[PDB]
Amino acid sequence: RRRKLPATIILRALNYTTEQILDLFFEKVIFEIRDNKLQMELVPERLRGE
Amino acid sequence: QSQLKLLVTRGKEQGYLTYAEVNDHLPEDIVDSDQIEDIIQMINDMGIQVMEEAPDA
Amino acid sequence: ETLRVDPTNDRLSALVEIYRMMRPGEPPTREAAESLFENLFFSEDRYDLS
């Protein structure tokens, strides 16, 4: 019960890099750049309410 | 900027004088027994103008 | 957003920031900044959920 700090500082205090932190809460989306264009790993269920 | 805008915009007027709020929204080394009286002195009593006497100090 | 408002970038700065938040006074070192954080949630003599 003291002053507030960003709750990612304890994660870094547990030896977690920023990239690792990002791969612990969110689902990643991979894009490919082939044939001079932009593709996407589409997931139909994710397109809910957009 | 930071301290002034946050303090003024928030405390309007925080109703029950929510002390346990902006004291964390302040810099430097915390948990002092010095900065305390400088906040319980401004909020009420000489309202409106006192909030203009705070930043200038 | 939490990462966006996070000053620290690694483990050292994190442990040091926590050390300065908990014990604001003496200059944060290596042993102190680490041992303090360890004796908060990772030591039986300083933490116990029974």
Swiss-Prot record, chain B:
Annotated region (Sigma-70 factor domain-1) at 1-57
Compartments it resides in: Cytoplasm
Name the job this protein performs: Sigma factors are initiation factors that promote the attachment of RNA polymerase to specific initiation sites and are then released. This sigma factor is the primary sigma factor during exponential growth. Preferentially transcribes genes associated with fast growth, such as ribosomal operons, other protein-synthesis related genes, rRNA- and tRNA-encoding genes and prfB.
The protein's assembly and partners:
Interacts transiently with the RNA polymerase catalytic core formed by RpoA, RpoB, RpoC and RpoZ (2 alpha, 1 beta, 1 beta' and 1 omega subunit) to form the RNA polymerase holoenzyme that can initiate transcription. Identified in a complex containing RpoD, the RNA polymerase subunits RpoA, RpoB and RpoZ, CRP and DNA. Interacts with Rsd; this prevents interaction with the RNA polymerase catalytic core and with promoter DNA, and as a consequence, promotes transcription from promoters that require alternative sigma factors. (Microbial infection) Interacts with Escherichia phage lambda antitermination protein Q.
Which family is this protein grouped under?
A: Belongs to the sigma-70 factor family. RpoD/SigA subfamily.
UniProt domain comment: Contains 4 domains, connected by flexible linkers. In the active conformation, the domains are in an extended conformation, each making extensive interactions with the RNA polymerase catalytic core. In the autoinhibited state, sigma-70 factor domain-1 packs closely together with sigma-70 factor domains-2 and -4, contrary to the extended conformation that is seen when the protein is part of the RNA polymerase holoenzyme.
Task: Supply the name of the protein.
Answer: RNA polymerase sigma factor RpoD
Say which species the protein is native to.
Answer: Escherichia coli (strain K12)
Could you tell me the gene encoding this protein? rpoD
UniProtKB/Swiss-Prot annotation, chain C:
Q: How is it modified after translation?
A: Acetylated on several lysine residues in the presence of glucose.
Reported biotechnological use = Co-administration of salinamide and rifampicin or salinamide and myxopyronin suppresses the emergence of resistance to both antibiotics.
Q: Where are the transmembrane segments?
A: none
User: How does it associate, per the subunit comment?
Assistant: The RNAP catalytic core consists of 2 alpha, 1 beta, 1 beta' and 1 omega subunit. When a sigma factor is associated with the core the holoenzyme is formed, which can initiate transcription. The rRNA transcription and antitermination complex (rrnTAC) consists of RNAP, NusA, NusB, NusE (rpsJ), NusG, SubB, ribosomal protein S4, DNA and precursor rRNA; S4 is more flexible than other subunits. In pull-down experiments interacts with CedA.
Described function:
DNA-dependent RNA polymerase (RNAP) catalyzes the transcription of DNA into RNA using the four ribonucleoside triphosphates as substrates.
* Homology family: Belongs to the RNA polymerase beta chain family.
Q: What is this protein called?
A: DNA-directed RNA polymerase subunit beta
Q: Which organism is it from?
A: Escherichia coli (strain K12)
